[PDB]
């Protein structure tokens, strides 16, 4: 799974 500290609200490009 993703890093818990990461933010899903980002540009994927």
């Amino acid at each position, epitope marked *: 799974n993703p890093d818990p500290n990461a933010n*899903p*609200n980002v*540009d994927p490009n």
Partner: antibody, heavy 119, light 111 residues
Framework: QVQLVQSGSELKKPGASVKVSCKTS????????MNWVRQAPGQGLEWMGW????????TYAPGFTGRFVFSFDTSVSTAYLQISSLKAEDTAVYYC????????????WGQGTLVTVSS | QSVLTQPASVSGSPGQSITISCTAT?????????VSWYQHHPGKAPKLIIH???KRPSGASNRFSGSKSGNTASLTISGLQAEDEADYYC??????????FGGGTKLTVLG
């Protein structure tokens, strides 16, 4: 203070439209995703999807595809939920909820908006 | 048919401790470490009380704790009090930037 404040109760006929608002304050609106959650009478919470406030892209859960629209207006830091082809079984409380991170989802919630659909 | 299974109801008497289970029924939870819990009183917004299986945010009493064994996450409430009577939901990331809630558990405090 982070605050999500939703619009008031709605009463609609089957086949009508509805648009619910979620006005935010106390944080940078485009840094965090806005999620939507539905609770029908005598049922649990159901995750409906989210809108990416950096790109604008919406993501719908299965079962909320086809007639649901997530949007936002950055000039007033408000997110919106639009529902078409309303039917009686859309009667529910609709919540917006912020996601801070993968580890901390739904840390702040709107107070809910009741939408009643009846003929 | 949620992918996270919770008992429909649990009960306890004031002062006791109770446990609510949340078992994942699918592999889309992956490592199952992005598990959060919510307390929901009627007429009020749900409240985050546990995230990342066991982390307690500021504002949630230290009577609320989360754990995991295998694919079953558990919420434990210590020193049960009348105001704990509410609905409780577990929640998991389920990949591709999607989330799911458990069916919820109604906690009754027999006071």
């Amino acid at each position: 203070q982070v605050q999500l404040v939703q619009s008031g109760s709605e009463l609609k006929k089957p086949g009508a439209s509805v648009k619910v608002s979620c006005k935010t304050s106390g944080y940078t609106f485009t840094t965090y995703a806005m999620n939507w959650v539905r609770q029908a009478p005598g049922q649990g919470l159901e995750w409906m999807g989210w809108i990416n406030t950096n790109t604008g892209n919406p993501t719908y859960a299965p079962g909320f595809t086809g007639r649901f629209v997530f949007s936002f207006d950055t000039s007033v830091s408000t997110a919106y939920l639009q529902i078409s082809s309303l039917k009686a079984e859309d009667t529910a409380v609709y919540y917006c909820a912020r996601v801070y991170s993968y580890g901390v989802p739904f840390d702040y919630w709107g107070q809910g908006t009741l939408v009643t659909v009846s003929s | 048919q949620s992918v996270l299974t919770q008992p429909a109801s649990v009960s306890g008497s004031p002062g006791q401790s109770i446990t609510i289970s949340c078992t994942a029924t699918s592999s889309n939870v992956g490592s199952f470490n992005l598990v959060s819990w919510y307390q929901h009183h009627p007429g009020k917004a749900p409240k985050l009380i546990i995230h990342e299986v066991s982390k307690r945010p500021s504002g949630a009493s230290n009577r609320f704790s989360g754990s995991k064994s295998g694919n079953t996450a558990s919420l434990t409430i210590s020193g049960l009090q009348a105001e704990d009577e509410a609905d409780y939901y577990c929640c998991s990331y389920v990949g591709s930037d999607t989330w799911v809630f458990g069916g919820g558990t109604k906690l009754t405090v027999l006071g």
